[PDB]
């Protein structure tokens, strides 16, 4: 359709005036002293919350330029940074800052490209420094300590998380479930988790959970692509006759099959779901064989074995106690099949690993082995009442995610103090041109923004607090919870370094894109 | 959709405007001398009413900010507090005063978080004083006195209320019925009760009553969750063959089953409802077995006994005399089955209680025991005219609720004098900062507002009246009816303590939330 | 519908203003240091891109005159020049420059016809000069060098490209397929590609592929025109019995059959395609029978053999491994039939070439022979994951296209300097009149624009760079990537002369059209 286009600083000004509103809407909800936002519900009661992700994904500006700028920030910050709420807020605020100061410096009349080059050099140095000073954790004692810290000082939750980590391992997979009792219980059953999520966004079995959950389902495994391919009705025959739901795994589904399945879900709501193949090439075939054995079924590729989706049988397919699917992830638990066949497959994997030597091949064989040999820890979190156990499950999931990230990469000072400790690193940097120096100093200026915003949310004057922290030792920050400077790590105020690194990288990239954008095209209303 | 946003005081001002109109609208219907409101009906003659809850629930402003403020206040005010009409009104007025003066002080440059801290401290002191000062009720004579007081001087109402309460127990179940005669009389029968409301908000049998009722129904009990599960037809075939209605009790119902039931209710209006199980886990199954024995039915869980919803029989289900379903509550009376099995369940519960030692297990067994051993008292209130008996129904229900609240927590001086007796206790508190002192002073100022409003309703100058009351003893207050200073306790001008506590807490919470909110998001019209 | 008309300058100015928007919106992305552009997506996040083709295809002005100028410029530049990204942008910018200069010179009274004459003479001089100076490449070592250069220095890409080139030749056919492995692999297969595209624009099999994809198909070949003709459903009988898809080659398809098939494709999506015949007359028949032998089918011409579309047999037609159809091109590979048939057809083709003497007939026989005797190269690009192989495939396709374009017409200096080397050649030309002289001057002025724009995108002052370039030697240019003055050819910064020639021709023609247009008609809003 007809388009309205804006070029250069004129468009960048609109970009900035659009992003700043989002930045302010997300800043006040950061830190333990975060303020609150009230969200309009045109149909129900207003929603009050203190979640950065919610407010960030909520707002949507009226003007086209402002709207597209806000969406640019939103999509990257959310999709790329979603594990920790503080991470997305930090990325958003840092991006807003950097874009603004870069915009003013460009307006002064400098060269944007070298400004961005200096920005990238500064962020590289900051990341190197943060990696240097990020002390790791590899002990069960440290694991329990960090888990308890993520639980806001709660003990038993961190204890059970440490127990699970001990029983399974870091690469191990852990889940939660309603314990229907008075104490959270730890259990390990056979589980098969892989990194392919749902294929149909509209396919959400549980609206409240942003999740797809099924139990006691048969499975379909076929190497050949099943996109736009009919003759799945034979499967539907047993799916309707047998109350057991179904799960589909194929190379991909698109066109007629995807449309009919999703429309049936929307209207009829038949209990069948589909996902992508986990592996790649011969690795794909090996993994497919592995979990086909794990489920008692068979891969339904026509090459080699003679079997097709045109005909289905109750005993030809696999059986699984339950399969759960989500974004980018999906796992099945308590499969079926011959246990001797399982042992034979395990021996085959072992001998293949022993004979094989290549780093890639050995690593893939180890991953395949662990995918079946090791179990999945399910946290049967239990309590008195359904609402209470719901809240408890939310808390324990948050703690598990936080501790998993921390062990994955490490820990640095929380409370927005991690960045302030990297300030010395930039001094080692030197500029080839003045624009690079300006980029470096702009990064230096933005480094202190998270701490200042945390202070503002706490209500204390930001400048004094940040000056004190910078002048103070490299071991004590500022505690907004108690409004004083304390020994953070021992007091249990930290944040997984992975979150900080991701937030800084995303903010740098987004702000660089905004400050280097030259042409904007938008449709006339 | 496009969103409009406002920040800080700029948005809180519109919030204050929105709450102001609601507060002023509901203030005039406070106390015995409150005036009336003219609510408009687009179809028929306007109704004139003097009930705070009704007027509050009615209004809705135009501007998004004003409307959202009013709706926010009313939401908590009504939902949390819905027992005594004056409670919601006083909560709203208190919230208005707190928020107004807090915003006024914040505009000068106060610290919102410290102001909230001081406000919370003052509210804690006030509630502690109220708890220590409230006299309890633990005797049939005092129960009769307070009931007659709630009965507005009516004697027989208090007499029957006290008789029922002492006959069944201070914490037993109680209800009302139609006397179809000239004099109310009492009857106790086998009864069933549990704190669960109807799953379907729209599912109301009687529009007038706001309740759902059914007579001589059969029941369905399935520990299995029956959410999104078809094959409820086997219930429907005997529901239509036999004239008796049906009911389901299971873990939860949602999706296709809920949709078919709701569309049937809208179109067919079939006589079947479903609700949630009140118990939890082992408690859930034990309670389900108990009620199955009480009704002569059986739990339809698959484990153990082999029986599903696919096949049903008239004698496989339970039989009950009558069912009432309401908000947060549902009940069954005059169940069927083997009385020998009933005594067997009583004996097994008794021995389980004797062997058990855990406090929680003992309490749960006590609750389950009383859930069967003690019957349900019905107050069949009679008279001459249908209008007469309906007025008696409303009056007796109001008195019953008031006396239940009083016996649940106790009694304190009415006419709003209760809070005024808490004013001196504020001297005990000390402010860490000036902001906390300010907040305490704010609570002190607002503590007199209910008396202000009651006096204004009586038309007398409120400030002079409260000055006299505070300068006077801690036993004599002001009566609006007689328009003079009197001794309330023996003059029957009181109010249950629990209502005052709940209203004060909710008003404090909502006012703090309003005065602390920073950013507001609302969709553009 | 009513129409509005404008004359002379009062319309040329409107069209020039319109084209200015597109020219500026596409100038920035030119060059390796091209900036980005924000494209609005009405449903998803705004698209960020740095590709001239996309932005040029995207924008659409509002005013009819400006809109039509932009539309004609984009249409000619894109459709006439679409092989390389930079060619279209160069065409657009050069056209805008010359159009503006010519409009300015006409404004003072210059004769547009003679201005155009001089412009075309200058274009002829420059094209002759660059063709003279175009250094060629025909050696496998040079092929690998240029392929790596196009591959951004990637070595294995150039290696595999050179291997395929050697094994299949300059005029042979090469495509790239998914490797499903960890290393790109090469093989030669029997193929049959001709220069006819899909008849149906709405017949894009793969939405993302911008192409038609089909596999393991049969073919219908009919000499007769099958436009508007029914009775193809007999083929659909086996096309539905066998899930095998079908392809058709006839003289043309239009009217009844075309509408029916496009409807069935839009709604039913049946797996059948048709395309036009590649040859002409006796050549058409010869190619059709050659490919019928290649596939084992038969041409359905009614004369001679008695076979019709009315009657079909699964074995009557030919079988082919894969069906790929795209714009202006379609290839069929892995045909079936009798290899003795292939051998005897090749033998008789060889004998016909031996006996024939006409050069046109000789070359037609040569291409017909090569159609079958030699195979087609398919590159099995591989990798770890689907996204990785997708990116690798895109890069390999781009590199293959660039190297083919270079090898077919040699190479010239990259970075836009190639034109700058041709400035002296304009000294030879002598214009008959002063208007032709002004045209020569205009072309001299515009010849410097592309390098100027690349420099501006790099941020360096373009005028200084171009003045140095023209004052420097004939072997050294400026690299924006390194921001220095380097010898381009061995620095791996070059561009095929075909792109330069096509862009220059199209730009000159479009600008001549714009400078000569006298009357513009537009529909009333």
UniProtKB/Swiss-Prot annotation, chains A, B, C:
Domain of life according to the entry: Eukaryota
Modified positions (N6-malonyllysine) in chain numbering: 108
Listed GO MF terms: apolipoprotein A-I binding; apolipoprotein binding; ATP binding; ATP hydrolysis activity; ATP-dependent protein folding chaperone; cysteine-type endopeptidase activator activity; DNA replication origin binding; double-stranded RNA binding
Biological processes, Gene Ontology terms: 'de novo' protein folding; apoptotic mitochondrial changes; B cell activation; B cell proliferation; biological process involved in interaction with symbiont; cellular response to interleukin-7; chaperone-mediated protein complex assembly; isotype switching to IgG isotypes
EC number(s) recorded for this UniProt protein: 5.6.1.7
Enzyme's top EC category: isomerase
Residues where N6-acetyllysine is found: 50, 57, 62, 66, 100, 105, 108, 131, 166, 177, 180, 193, 211, 224-225, 244, 267, 289, 327, 334, 364, 371, 444, 456
Modified-residue entries (Phosphoserine), positions: 42, 45, 385, 463
Clinical disorder: Spastic paraplegia 13, autosomal dominant: A form of spastic paraplegia, a neurodegenerative disorder characterized by a slow, gradual, progressive weakness and spasticity of the lower limbs. Rate of progression and the severity of symptoms are quite variable. Initial symptoms may include difficulty with balance, weakness and stiffness in the legs, muscle spasms, and dragging the toes when walking. In some forms of the disorder, bladder symptoms (such as incontinence) may appear, or the weakness and stiffness may spread to other parts of the body. Leukodystrophy, hypomyelinating, 4: A severe autosomal recessive hypomyelinating leukodystrophy. Clinically characterized by infantile-onset rotary nystagmus, progressive spastic paraplegia, neurologic regression, motor impairment, profound intellectual disability. Death usually occurs within the first two decades of life.
Subunit structure: Homoheptamer arranged in a ring structure. The functional units of these chaperonins consist of heptameric rings of the large subunit Hsp60, which function as a back-to-back double ring. Interacts with 2 heptameric Hsp10 rings to form the symmetrical football complex. Interacts with HRAS. Interacts with ATAD3A. Interacts with ETFBKMT and EEF1AKMT3. Interacts with MFHAS1. (Microbial infection) Interacts with hepatitis B virus/HBV protein X.
Record PANTHER family: 60 KDA HEAT SHOCK PROTEIN, MITOCHONDRIAL
This protein's name: 60 kDa heat shock protein, mitochondrial
Gene that encodes it: HSPD1
């Amino acid at each position: 359709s007809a388009k309205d286009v804006k070029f250069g600083a004129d468009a960048r000004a609109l970009m900035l005036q659009g992003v700043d509103l989002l930045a302010d809407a997300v800043a006040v909800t950061m830190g333990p002293k975060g303020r609150t936002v009230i969200i309009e519900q045109s149909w129900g009661s207003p929603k009050v919350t203190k979640d950065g992700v919610t407010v960030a994904k909520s707002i949507d500006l009226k003007d086209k330029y402002k709207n597209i700028g806000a969406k640019l920030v939103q999509d990257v910050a959310n999709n790329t940074n979603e594990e920790a709420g503080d991470g997305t807020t930090t990325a958003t605020v840092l991006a807003r800052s950097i874009a603004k100061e870069g915009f003013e410096k460009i307006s002064k009349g400098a060269n944007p490209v070298e400004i961005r080059r200096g920005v990238m050099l500064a962020v590289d140095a900051v990341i190197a420094e943060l990696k240097k000073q990020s002390k790791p954790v590899t002990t069960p004692e440290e694991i329990a300590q960090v888990a308890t810290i993520s639980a806001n000082g709660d003990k038993e939750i961190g204890n059970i998380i440490s127990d699970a980590m001990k029983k399974v391992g870091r690469k191990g997979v852990i889940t939660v479930k309603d314990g229907k009792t008075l104490n959270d219980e730890l259990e390990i059953i056979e589980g098969m988790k892989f990194d392919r999520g749902y294929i149909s966004p509209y396919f959400i079995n549980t609206s409240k959970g942003q999740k797809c959950e099924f139990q006691d389902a048969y499975v379909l495994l076929s190497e050949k692509k099943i996109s736009s391919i009919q003759s799945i009705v034979p499967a539907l025959e047993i799916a309707n006759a047998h109350r057991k739901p179904l799960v589909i795994i194929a190379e991909d589904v698109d066109g007629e099959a995807l449309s009919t399945l999703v429309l049936n879900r929307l209207k009829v709501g038949l209990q069948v779901v589909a996902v992508k193949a986990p592996g790649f090439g011969d690795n794909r075939k090996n993994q497919l064989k592995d979990m086909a054995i794990a489920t008692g079924g068979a891969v339904f590729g026509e090459e080699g074995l003679t079997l097709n989706l045109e005909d289905v049988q109750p005993h030809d397919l696999g059986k699984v106690g339950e399969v759960i699917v989500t974004k980018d992830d999906a796992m099945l638990l308590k499969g079926k099949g011959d246990k001797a066949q399982i042992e034979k497959r395990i021996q085959e994997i072992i001998e293949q690993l022993d004979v094989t030597t290549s780093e890639y091949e050995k690593e893939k064989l180890n991953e395949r082995l662990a995918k079946l040999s090791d179990g999945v820890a399910v946290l049967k979190v239990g309590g008195t009442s359904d609402v209470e156990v719901n809240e408890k499950k939310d808390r324990v999931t948050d703690a598990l995610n936080a501790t998993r990230a921390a062990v994955e990469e490490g820990i640095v000072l929380g409370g927005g103090c991690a960045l302030l400790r990297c300030i010395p690193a930039l001094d080692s940097l030197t500029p080839a041109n003045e624009d690079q120096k300006i980029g470096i100093e702009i990064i230096k200026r933005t480094l202190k923004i998270p701490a200042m915003t945390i202070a503002k949310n706490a209500g204390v004057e930001g400048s004094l607090i940040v000056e004190k922290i910078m002048q103070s030792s490299s071991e004590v920050g500022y505690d907004a919870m108690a409004g004083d400077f304390v020994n953070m790590v021992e007091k249990g105020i930290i944040d997984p370094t992975k979150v900080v690194r991701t937030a800084l990288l995303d903010a740098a990239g987004v702000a660089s894109l905004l400050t280097t954008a030259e042409v904007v095209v938008t449709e006339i209303p």
